[PDB]
């Protein structure tokens, strides 16, 4: 029961919300894989009337790439309980978002007979802090 209940990292999303790009290059080095362009929506007074146009870049790491990054990434932050989502997620900062979830999360990500994960199988800030804190660092 506990085996299919113990949390895990689904994805590590590192992104730099600029506002006009050239920054892609560093993310590629700090993470290990190709970054992606970020387009914006709606016209913006702040000389941002152009809808589809580069404004940021992100990277979604999964599995090793995720941990190998967090290893030398988490030590760079001072995690606090507040910095945690209601789903058991947390982000710090260049931004670093960590998406944590239980074993059969795919049930809500597959094409056929997908289903929303029950509030019971959903992760919690509490169960989140633990898992993480239970690995190279401290909470609050």
């Amino acid at each position: 029961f506990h085996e299919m209940r113990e949390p895990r990292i689904e994805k590590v999303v590192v992104h730099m919300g600029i506002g006009h790009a050239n920054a892609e290059d560093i993310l590629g080095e700090i993470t290990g894989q190709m970054p992606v362009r970020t387009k914006a929506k709606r016209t913006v007074g702040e000389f941002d009337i152009r809808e589809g146009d580069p404004i940021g870049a992100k990277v979604t790491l999964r599995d090793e790439m995720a941990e190998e990054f967090l290893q030398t990434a988490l030590p760079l932050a001072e995690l606090a309980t507040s910095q945690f989502d209601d789903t058991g997620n947390f982000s710090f900062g260049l931004d670093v978002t960590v998406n944590l979830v239980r074993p059969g999360y795919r049930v809500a990500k597959r094409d056929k007979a997908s289903r929303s994960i029950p509030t019971k199988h959903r992760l919690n800030p509490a169960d989140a802090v633990a898992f993480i804190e239970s690995t190279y660092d401290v909470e609050v």
Partner: protein
């Protein structure tokens, strides 16, 4: 759910099991549907027709009943998918069915996939089905060659239980050979 005016989707839609828009287009042919479905371990082919109170399956074949004709191999692969279509196809021919349109449900039209193998299998059984040859994996892969070469990169047998070490696409031939033959007890 929320109130009187709330709109709940059709059941097969909530269950995320039936693409109704694709279904309609499918049914517009007037021909039966070769329903190709797949499980983590198995593959199923059904020849379905329209009915007053629901659909009518006229013939079908599951990868399980493959062993019934001499199959000691796994059932969630290409050779399995093809032969399964062929068996369902053959039985289809038996019940009088002569043509069909491929219904892959919520699966993707990926070139060379198993839903397409099921289709090539059903076609070889003599069923007339609108298709496209260059979307079907090439013969060898259907035989299961891709898995043989994979077992070549051995060091540890690909299959746990022992069906064979370097596997056998030749077994595919035996079974297909057995099906294309008349004697067979459909």
């Amino acid at each position: 759910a929320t109130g009187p005016r709330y709109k709940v989707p059709m059941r097969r839609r909530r269950e995320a099991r039936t693409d109704y828009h694709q279904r309609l287009r499918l049914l517009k042919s007037g021909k039966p549907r070769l329903v190709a479905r797949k499980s983590n371990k198995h593959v199923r082919a059904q020849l379905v027709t329209l009915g007053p109170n629901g659909d009518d399956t006229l013939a079908s074949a599951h990868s399980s009943d493959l062993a019934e004709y001499g199959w000691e191999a796994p059932t969630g692969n290409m050779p399995s998918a093809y032969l399964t279509g062929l068996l369902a196809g053959l039985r289809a021919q038996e019940a009088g069915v002569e043509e069909a349109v491929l219904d892959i449900g919520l699966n993707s039209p990926t070139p060379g996939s198993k839903v397409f193998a099921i289709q090539e299998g059903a076609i070889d059984a003599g069923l007339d089905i609108p298709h496209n040859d260059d979307v079907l994996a090439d013969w060898q892969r259907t035989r299961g060659a891709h898995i043989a070469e994979y077992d070549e990169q051995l060091e540890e047998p690909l299959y746990s239980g022992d069906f064979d070490a370097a596997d056998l696409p030749e077994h595919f031939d035996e079974l297909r050979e057995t099906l294309l033959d008349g004697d067979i007890e459909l």
